[PDB]
Each structure stands twice: as C-alpha cells, then as structure tokens.
Amino acid sequence: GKILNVEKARFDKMLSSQEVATLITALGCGIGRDEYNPDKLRYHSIIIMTDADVDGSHIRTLLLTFFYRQPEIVERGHVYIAQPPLYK
DNA sequence: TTTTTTTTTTTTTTTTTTTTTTTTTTTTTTTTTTTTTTTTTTTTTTTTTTTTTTTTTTTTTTTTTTTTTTTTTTTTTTTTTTTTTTTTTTTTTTTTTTTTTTTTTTTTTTTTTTTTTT
Structure with a gap:
C-alpha cells in the first residue's frame, strides 16, 4: 500500500516494514x-512501477520523496x- | 428519647509472587587463503632404426648348511557367556490437498484536543 x-x-x-525492506534491498545501510x-547499491536501475491510477501517482510521489530526502541515488x-497503461 | 451491639471497607503499608529489562556461551556466516583444471609454446624431452664390444648363462663337477627329522610342552586357539554397538519394524507427529467456520493489521489527508518536555 502507501x-x-x-x-x-x-x-x-x-523503522517500518516497508521502508526497512526497501533499504535492505537497496543495501544503502538504511541510515542517512x-x-x-x-x-x-545492488541495482543501478530502480524502477517505480506503481499502478496506472491516481493512488498510484500518490504512492509514486511518496517514493520520490523517500528517494530524494533519504539523494545521490537520484x-x-x-x-x-x-x-503502464490505464486503458485497453 | 437516649443509649448499646455488630458489620464491613477503608486509613491502608508490608510480604509474596509475577512480570519485564538484561547480557555468557556454542552455533552461524562473510572474508582471505590455499587446492584444482585448461590453454601456449617452448626448449626440451623422448620414441624409433642401424652398429658395436660386452658380461652373464649354460657344457661339467664339488661340497655343506640349510633341508631332513621326532618329540615336549608350551599358548594361541576355540568355546561359552555377556555387554556395546549397529541396524531395521513400529509408532508418532506434521504437512499438503479443497470447500467451510472465524478473524487481524500498516499507511495518506486536515483539524482539534490531550500529554509530555523546555
């Protein structure tokens, strides 16, 4: 979710499950x-593939805030x- | 109208137990260090004809010290018994399959109030 x-x-x-999981996968040690x-960094391409709707856009904004505030990666x-497409 | 008996929850604070924060020891886990395998080429090693002078085996005979030999008495071998380990039937427990019964959590967003710290 969000x-x-x-x-x-x-x-x-x-110290929450989602952020801890992302920090473990990226392997930046999880401290500023x-x-x-x-x-x-374990992946040189980090791809934010959220849903193709409004709440996907909100979660994308939250992820971008996390990546920028917590910056050299960006x-x-x-x-x-x-x-991804919304309509077929 | 005054006066007399009894009953319990509170002033309780202390003893016992429980709950909740702690950190020594054997079992994991990432690192460096040492065993394995495949190519180049490279001087180097190694396979195969010819000649040659050698040095050990086969005519013949000799002996002596290892091969004959018999026998006493040991002592390793075998017997029974019992313990220790190995290995396999037996039992128990747990997991997965597909329709059923039940539940439980983490975050945005704003605005207002409690509830601690300075």
Missing part, C-alpha cells in the same frame, strides 16, 4: 549519513519511472 511520508514522519519512525554508502540517475 508508505510513510518521510517529510512529515520523524527519523525514528523510519552514519554509514550511507551509495557505491554498494542525482546519479539510477531512479526510473515506468508508465
């Missing part, structure tokens, strides 16, 4: 600067956005 709004959520609230090592160009 993920935490890290802009509104405290840094201590980041204490041991943040973007060179050990700057290096490893983040992508998929565009």
